[PDB]
Design a protein around this ligand. Structure first.
Ligand SMILES: Nc1ncnc2c1ncn2[C@@H]1O[C@H](COP(=O)(O)OP(=O)(O)OP(=O)(O)O)[C@@H](O)[C@H]1O
Ligand SMILES: Nc1ncnc2c1ncn2[C@@H]1O[C@H](COP(=O)(O)OP(=O)(O)O)[C@@H](O)[C@H]1O
Lengths: 179, 53, 481, 72, 500, 12, 59, 480, 72
């Protein structure tokens, strides 16, 4: 495991023991869109800034968006330890550990064109029947490089891949050269 | 030394064979390529229908 | 033990770092098997041992078989105890790799009684007080440099010089004289020489093709194909397979390790793989503790001795560097097999002069044994000195005072060569077993000087002194014709 | 150290449940990373440099080098 | 053909039909000048070679947690830090058939000579469980190198993996070439793998093999130095997987590695790049495991498997002539004995520069034929006595006849041993040569003329007494009729050599 | 190695 | 070897003909698919591929 | 290209720059840094990417001066691996590693550029005609013959030779080989390079009048350069030679000196680059980098690149990896020994260790092979009797072995050459001797037929007749 | 050693003894090899004497300046 993965596993474990896992996931999405937009990251980093000013501004940002307290507790502990500079990576791996704990799996269906929602749910049926996740989430990405079909990037993170696409030509022609 | 001169003879044989046969084959590949071009348009049309079911 | 389902997170070379649920983690040196898969399509399991804990529920473990093809996240299963080696009367004759599966392909071993590899040391209430020497059955060993019963023994000699016939004779003699039983435990044994040894065993009757569990060897073969985890733990496997023998049957067990430096080399590989900072010349940091755990379970407990014989391959031939140093800190008797003696044909090729033992001292052996042994060594020293000068002067030219010394030294060097119970397959010599009493009286009779007129070749390849005089009078009876 | 020894998920859960809350562990520590004969312990802030800490099985440990969090 | 060229394309494009399998695929974090720390390849078997989006095949050795650190089997310039790299169900195999005979190949088993393309429908996995002790047997039949030194003093039997160690530029490649060139009358498939030798030296060796005609049966697995670290690492394993197939199908082989120093040095490179902790001499943890895993598949099988044998003969270049360094002591612990070439003996005229000393062989007289079992005993004993008395040679001033004649026969014996470049001496001729040297039938000649007299004697005997050939090649013993025939032949040749 | 090699030379 | 060096070059030329002239063919075929970019293609191909793909997955 | 850089860190010469995520240069792809100098704005220091760190930033060793660079500077990548101008323009000019002229004359044209780091030539086309060369040195033309169209190694300690020997060899062969010469100053002292430039412009090789008439084209990445430049000066010289072997089809003789610097600079940048240290302290990729240089030098059926690298065996560590991997690549190694320059025998080439793949009889001549065998055996005998001579008195060895010792002494003096470029150190005029004259000299010297001359009549002598005359002069001035 | 040699001396020193370094480096072997001696002829007996007279004078007591002719 990575340090970001450990901290994210802590946050997901607390959001597991307290029945606020979905609210905490939404709160992490809010917090990662906060810790994007560099100047905020630059402020919470830069150890020249005094710790009291940092925690005060963090309290203000907490009471602004109405976060869950244990997630606010998580960011405040991140400020306590010197590991606040990993905050983007921790909030990024939170999605992984949260999907693993709540039991759902992500399948990024990348096709040439946007896909119908019922047929996307059919893709979710299939991916679920090979993975075995409860609420399989499908975030689709329109792509111009593909030609007719689609690619699925289900798995841990990109790990498994099935694609009926320009890869059809690519494999037929890797077997056409035959050297 | 006579064996060395015979080696020079065989070396001139590989010179002429290599050069003329390589020229003729480098011409043959272009001849077949320009013979293929209409059939590569036909082949592309064939692949298009195969990959569009 | 239980389905401690874990993921094999990191696989570097042989080392495979596995994870676990947070509650149940196997302790250090606890064998865990992975439910691996072969690329040929067989669910082959490679067994592993937790060598170092890494904190985040992940126990860094080395593999006792190849990790080529081990999928990350493959189910790894704990055993809760160290590598269960199938000890007992069943493991008497067959060849075993480290996890204890018979690789000669004969048949499966009865796993009724199994002790772990890592049983701890015996305490001082267990270890024996009296320092009895070990009556092996070679006249050279049991006169000039006795082997300590319950202690360590070093065979510095090379291979081909006669190490295999020596160890074969020792195994047959331990089966014959005492109630003992041997356990050859070759660590990193080069598989060609391993098969050479196995076939010589089978052709010597030491082990029987037809009669297993009545044989006299428990072969544990650390191959070199296996990862460095396996040819390091093969030493401890031999240790526990002989320790169960001694602590169930109360018998003088032998334990032949192939080169301790090969065990230490395997330890160096496994520690460099674990990444712990290497010590002096490059052997592991826990060198003394590791090889002490290997060689301290070799002690004469009050049940019965587990006296072992350990080959030692010094690198670049210096006893100074740590691994031969921390070995010679343990060794209690060191007998070198000499290539010149082997080429002469004085089988066994053990060098009578350079072989030393800490057990030779008088309060240990007996005042008469120490006196006659010291005088034999001084006589052989006189002979090694005068071998320079009988090349120039000749035996009659130099003084007749020590010409008798040269003659008696010839008789001693010939009397040392014993026809073994294994050399019969090479020559048909029936072989004689010689206890300490017989060789003591015979060497006193030779060195005192009663047998000053017997021919030299009447002493060569003979057992007791009475049989030597029988050979002499035989030559006398044929001298008429 | 980037991989700090007092960053196990279970352990950092204990700290993450209370940010600036009810008092610390006075003499109760959970062992972690007990490997090459050198165990590490979370918390246990009462330990004097050189104090003699105990374990569950009954083994004794000198507490030489206590870092910021892990009292090694 | 004018459009049958594209009618051939129809075969493939209508045959393959794309079953939708799952390809393990992840991004590339880091391309580290010979390593590519790709991320996300989850269920990829350790060793399962990956294929990038630019067709750069590479093995996935280092399987860390968040980044599978693969190594590249080609140049890695065109990897583009994010290009989806797909795993391939291959586990680093090579195709292998008897059609590989003669063509020099890289470690991909792809021909680098040029003069064809090998087809092979039999694939052997490169790393494989080596022959176990149930399979292996003791070494019965010998393997003549063509050298009196390494065929009389210290044998090499089929199955025993003798080791050619020595100083740089001493004749290791030369003794290996002499072995492969002698091994013509026999049937062995002498796979010669070259690791990290320059391309031009491999060209010289392949054209030397061609000139001597031995190239019919010797797969020269060539690996030039600019091949990446992975390919020089993989070459011995590739040649081992070829000779292993040929051994399993009953054919005695002989694999001769080249510069295991260079091979483990390339492994040192790829592993130190791959962030594995280093041990002695900065060689990584599993150097000994590496050398064994490729060098302990050199065995003589049993009748249950086919009786064929792979008989390795590695070459370890040690600098300044030491046994003490890490890799030579590892390979000396692995190999069944070794031989010792020495730079000072080499520059002292003795070629091959076989050290008459420490170069022991673990097999011994269990390998040699009965004629050698007879005569090599006396040769070994006389070389031992001569080497002990070597200091007396420059100071022998009218010393007694035993010492004088023994030392003179030793001074002639070393000249008997030294033999020309690339001269293969088959078993029969070196038998009579050793006999001539050891039993005194060349003592009348001086030191210089021993070489000329023995070459002329071997010519005259092998061309005018073909019954000696029948006996030695057939009965494989030095029986009394052969002894008498050789005695009379040597006597007549000494008379005609007095006639000069 | 110009340090060990000198001593190897002197030993020989 | 003379007969086989020309074999190597004719084999290389044949396979280079194959790959290059096909590369031109597919660079044209993508343009022919540019008329079939979105309207008539994706529904048919996605439905059929999802059917056979779920089938291969359930196998 | 256009990929603006924003240099993140500058840790010594190795600087790592954080490109945008999509547009990222490849490995070994040049990066011209748009930066300011210490004074004055325009300053372009060139960097070649070594690896990609995955945080959108690549690590790039800097070919030019590293000071003055700030964190955050815009840099752009060429997209091409550091193109170098070669061909009919590169003649006569001392060239920088960047691909620039250094001798303050007019800039060259860039009509014939070429990538510096390219693929090695395949084994399929490899011209190997084994043939000897007559360089001019007595010993190295006799004891370790040199293979033209092949590689040659002038190994040695610090100051044993290998640069005066290279100067003598170039003074000989620059006029003999009708093909061009290329000198790669890989980490050699700047004053010796300038001595070489003056010697070349005086000896007509440069011919500064019409600079298109030179038979040479220099490349200097000499000592006073950041370790990027010494990591690629060898490859610049290699690219010039590879153009002269691909296009002009002429047998170009390239000289590299102190090729060990091409491994030392690699070490100094590799330690910084995060790559772990190897044995005694060089880079981990010693073998691959050394081979990536020394494999491109092969006669490749359009021409023959004979090259003479002067390896620097550091502190006479013959076992050091940086010469130990070069001994594998080098055909005609010539191990110069400090112990033989100790007694003044220049050149201090070891008669024993200087060995060649061209001392086979079918390649060199049977007479040449037998005389080289007898010379090398006599020197081996002298080395084995050194210890007996050293301690137990010169006379107490054998009397025939005393003949061998006197013969070995005469030989190891006679294989000394008065060079033309070393006339300043000896004071004696330089003498050139072919292979035939020194062969006939060694015959009569070792044959015992003229074993009566004094020893100093053989030392620092061009030929055998010169030795006989020197014996007359010496015996006359002895009594007089 | 010196990489500039007699190119960086006055013409006087280049004329008197430029072979001086080589002459002494050569005399080193005549010292060591003929040190353990037997049958020293007039060649060796006089060459060692010449070399000793050539080597002995190079013994400057420090802090004493020497003009170039005072070396010549
Ligand atoms: N019997 C012989 N007669 C003459 N020369 C020989 C003989 N044996 C070896 N040589 C010499 O040995 C040299 C080649 O030996 P080899 O290639 O083994 O040296 P090496 O440098 O150790 O090889 P590598 O480059 O693979 O390390 C040739 O130059 C050849 O002259
Ligand atoms: N033929 C020679 N005559 C006199 N001195 C020489 C000769 N060859 C070499 N030397 C001495 O040895 C040195 C070798 O040249 P140098 O450039 O120092 O070698 P390196 O490049 O190895 O340092 C010269 O400076 C010179 O003083």
């Amino acid at each position: 495991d990575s340090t970001a993965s450990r901290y994210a596993s802590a946050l997901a474990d607390v959001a597991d023991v307290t029945g606020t896992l979905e609210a905490t996931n939404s709160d992490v999405e809010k917090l990662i869109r906060i810790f994007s937009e560099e100047p905020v990251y630059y402020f919470f980093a830069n150890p020249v800034i005094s710790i009291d000013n940092k925690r005060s501004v963090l309290d203000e940002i907490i009471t602004t968006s109405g976060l869950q307290p244990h997630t606010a507790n998580f960011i405040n502990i991140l400020i306590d330890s010197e590991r606040i500079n990993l905050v983007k990576e921790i909030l990024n791996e939170f999605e992984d550990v949260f999907n693993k704990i709540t039991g759902t799996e992500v399948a990024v269906v990348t096709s040439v064109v946007k896909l119908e929602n019922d047929h996307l749910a059919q893709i979710a049926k299939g991916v679920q029947k090979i993975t075995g996740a409860k609420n399989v989430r499908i975030k689709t990405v329109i792509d111009p490089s593909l030609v007719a079909g689609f690619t699925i990037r289900y798995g841990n993170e990109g790990s498994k891949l099935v694609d009926m696409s320009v890869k059809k030509q690519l494999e037929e022609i890797a077997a056409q050269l035959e050297m | 030394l006579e064996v060395e001169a015979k080696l020079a003879e065989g070396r001139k044989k590989i010179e002429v064979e290599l050069q003329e046969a390589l020229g003729s084959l480098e011409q043959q590949k272009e001849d077949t390529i320009k013979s293929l071009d209409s059939q590569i348009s036909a082949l592309s049309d064939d692949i298009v229908k195969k990959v569009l079911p | 033990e239980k389905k401690n389902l874990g993921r094999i997170a990191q696989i570097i070379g042989p080392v495979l770092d596995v994870a676990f649920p947070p509650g149940k983690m196997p302790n250090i040196y606890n064998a865990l098997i992975v439910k691996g898969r072969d690329t040929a399509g067989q669910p082959m399991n490679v067994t592993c041992e937790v060598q170092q804990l890494l904190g985040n529920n992940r126990v860094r473990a080395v593999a006792m078989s190849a990790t080529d093809g081990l999928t990350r996240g493959m189910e790894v299963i704990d055993t809760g105890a160290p590598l269960s080696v199938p000890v007992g009367g069943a493991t008497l004759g067959r060849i075993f790799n480290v996890l204890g599966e018979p690789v000669d392909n004969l048949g499966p071993v009865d796993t009724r009684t199994t002790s772990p590899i890592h049983r701890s040391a015996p305490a001082f209430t267990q270890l024996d007080t009296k320092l009895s020497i070990f009556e092996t059955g070679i006249k050279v060993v049991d006169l000039l440099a006795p082997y300590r019963r319950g202690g360590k023994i070093g065979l510095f000699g090379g291979a081909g010089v006669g190490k295999t016939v020596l160890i074969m004779e020792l195994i047959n003699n331990i089966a014959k004289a005492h109630g003992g039983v041997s356990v050859f435990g070759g660590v990193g044994e080069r598989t060609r020489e391993g098969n050479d040894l196995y076939m010589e065993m089978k052709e010597s009757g030491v082990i029987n093709e037809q009669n297993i569990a009545e044989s006299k060897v428990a072969l544990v073969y650390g191959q070199m194909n296996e990862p460095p985890g396996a040819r390091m733990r093969v030493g401890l496997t031999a240790l526990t397979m002989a320790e169960y023998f001694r602590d169930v049957n109360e018998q003088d067990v032998l334990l032949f390790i192939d080169n301790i430096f090969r065990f230490v080399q395997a330890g160096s590989e496994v520690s460099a793989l674990l990444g712990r900072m290497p010590s002096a010349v490059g052997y592991q940091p826990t060198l003394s503790t590791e090889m002490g755990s290997l060689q301290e379970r070799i002690t004469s407990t009050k049940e019965g001795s587990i006296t072992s014989i350990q080959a030692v391959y010094v690198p670049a031939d210096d006893l100074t560097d740590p691994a031969p140093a921390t070995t010679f800190a343990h060794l209690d008797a060191t007998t070198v097999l000499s290539r010149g003696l082997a080429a002469k044909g004085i089988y066994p090729a053990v060098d009578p002069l350079d072989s030393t033992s800490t057990m030779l001292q008088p309060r240990i052996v007996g005042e008469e044994h120490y006196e006659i042994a010291q005088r034999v060594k001084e006589t052989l020293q006189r002979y090694k000195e005068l071998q320079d000068i009988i090349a120039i002067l000749g035996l009659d030219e130099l003084s007749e005072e020590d010409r008798l010394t040269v003659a008696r030294a010839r008789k001693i060097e010939r009397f040392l060569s014993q026809p073994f119970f294994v050399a019969e397959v090479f020559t048909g010599s029936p072989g004689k077993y010689v206890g300490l009493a017989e060789t003591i009286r015979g060497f006193q009779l030779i060195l005192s000087g009663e047998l000053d007129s017997l021919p030299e070749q009447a002493f060569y390849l003979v057992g007791n002194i009475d049989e030597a005089t029988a050979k002499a009078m035989n030559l006398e009876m044929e001298s008429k014709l | 150290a980037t991989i700090r020894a007092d960053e196990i998920s279970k352990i950092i859960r204990e700290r993450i449940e209370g940010y600036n809350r009810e008092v610390k562990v006075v003499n109760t520590g959970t062992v972690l990373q007990v490997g090459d004969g050198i165990a590490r312990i979370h918390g246990l802030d009462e330990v004097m440099a050189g104090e003699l800490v105990e374990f569950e099985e009954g083994t004794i440990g000198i507490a030489l080098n206590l870092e910021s969090n892990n009292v090694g | 053909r004018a459009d049958e060229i594209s009618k051939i394309i129809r075969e493939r494009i209508e045959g393959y039909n794309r079953e939708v399998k799952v390809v393990n695929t992840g991004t590339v974090l880091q391309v580290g000048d010979g390593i590519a720390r790709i991320h996300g390849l989850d269920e990829v078997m350790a060793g399962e070679l990956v294929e990038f989006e630019e067709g750069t095949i590479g093995i996935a050795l280092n399987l860390e947690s968040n980044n599978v650190g693969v190594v590249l089997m080609g140049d890695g310039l065109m990897i583009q830090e994010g290009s989806s790299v797909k795993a391939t169900g291959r586990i680093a195999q090579i195709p292998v058939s008897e059609a590989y005979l003669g063509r020099v190949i890289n470690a991909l088993a792809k021909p680098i000579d040029g003069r064809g393309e090998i087809t092979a429908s039999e694939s052997r996995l490169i790393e494989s469980p080596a022959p176990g002790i149930m399979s292996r047997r003791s070494v019965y039949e010998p393997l003549q190198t063509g050298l009196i030194a390494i065929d009389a003093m210290i044998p090499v039997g089929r199955g025993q993996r003798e080791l050619i160690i020595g100083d740089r530029q001493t004749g290791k490649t030369a003794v290996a070439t002499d072995t492969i060139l002698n091994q013509q009358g026999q049937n062995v498939i002498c796979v010669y793998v070259a690791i990290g030798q320059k391309a031009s030296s491999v060209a010289q060796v392949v054209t030397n093999f061609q000139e001597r005609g031995a190239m019919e049966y010797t797969i020269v697995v060539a690996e030039t130095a600019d091949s990446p670290a992975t390919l020089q690492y993989l070459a011995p394993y590739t040649g081992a997987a070829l000779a292993e197939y040929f051994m399993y199908r009953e054919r005695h082989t002989l694999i001769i590695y080249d510069d295991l120093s260079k091979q483990a040095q390339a492994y040192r490179q790829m592993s130190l790049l791959l962030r594995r902790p280093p041990g002695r001499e900065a060689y990584p943890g599993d150097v000994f495991y590496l050398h064994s895993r490729l060098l302990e598949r050199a065995a003589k099988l049993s009748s249950l498997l086919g009786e064929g044998s792979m008989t390795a003969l590695p070459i370890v270049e040690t600098q300044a002539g030491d046994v003490s360094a890490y890799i030579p002591t590892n390979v000396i612990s692995i190999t069944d004995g070794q031989i010792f070439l020495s730079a000072d003996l080499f520059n002292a005229g003795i070629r091959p520069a076989i050290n008459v000393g420490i170069s022991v062989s673990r097999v011994g007289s269990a390998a040699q034929i009965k004629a050698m079992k007879k005569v090599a005993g006396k040769l070994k004993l006389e070389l031992a006595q001569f080497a002990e008395l070597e200091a007396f040679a420059q100071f022998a001033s009218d010393l007694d006849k035993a010492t004088q004649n023994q030392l003179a026969r030793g001074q002639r014996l070393r000249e008997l041993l030294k033999q020309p470049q690339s001269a293969p001496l088959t078993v029969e001729e070196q038998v009579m040569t050793i006999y001539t040297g050891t039993n005194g039938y060349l003592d009348s000649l001086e030191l210089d003329q021993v070489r000329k007299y023995l070459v002329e004697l071997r010519t005259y005997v092998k061309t005018n007494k073909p019954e000696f050939q029948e006996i030695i090649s057939s009965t494989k013993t030095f029986t009394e009729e052969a002894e008498a025939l050789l005695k009379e032949a040597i006597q007549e040749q000494m008379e005609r050599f007095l006639l000069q | 190695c110009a340090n060990l090699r000198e001593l190897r030379d002197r030993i020989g | 070897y003379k007969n086989e060096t020309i074999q190597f070059e004719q084999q290389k030329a044949i396979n280079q003909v194959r790959q290059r002239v096909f590369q031109q063919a597919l660079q044209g075929a993508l343009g022919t698919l540019n008329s079939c970019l979105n309207n008539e293609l994706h529904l048919r191909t996605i439905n059929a591929n999802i059917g056979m793909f779920g089938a291969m997955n359930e196998i």
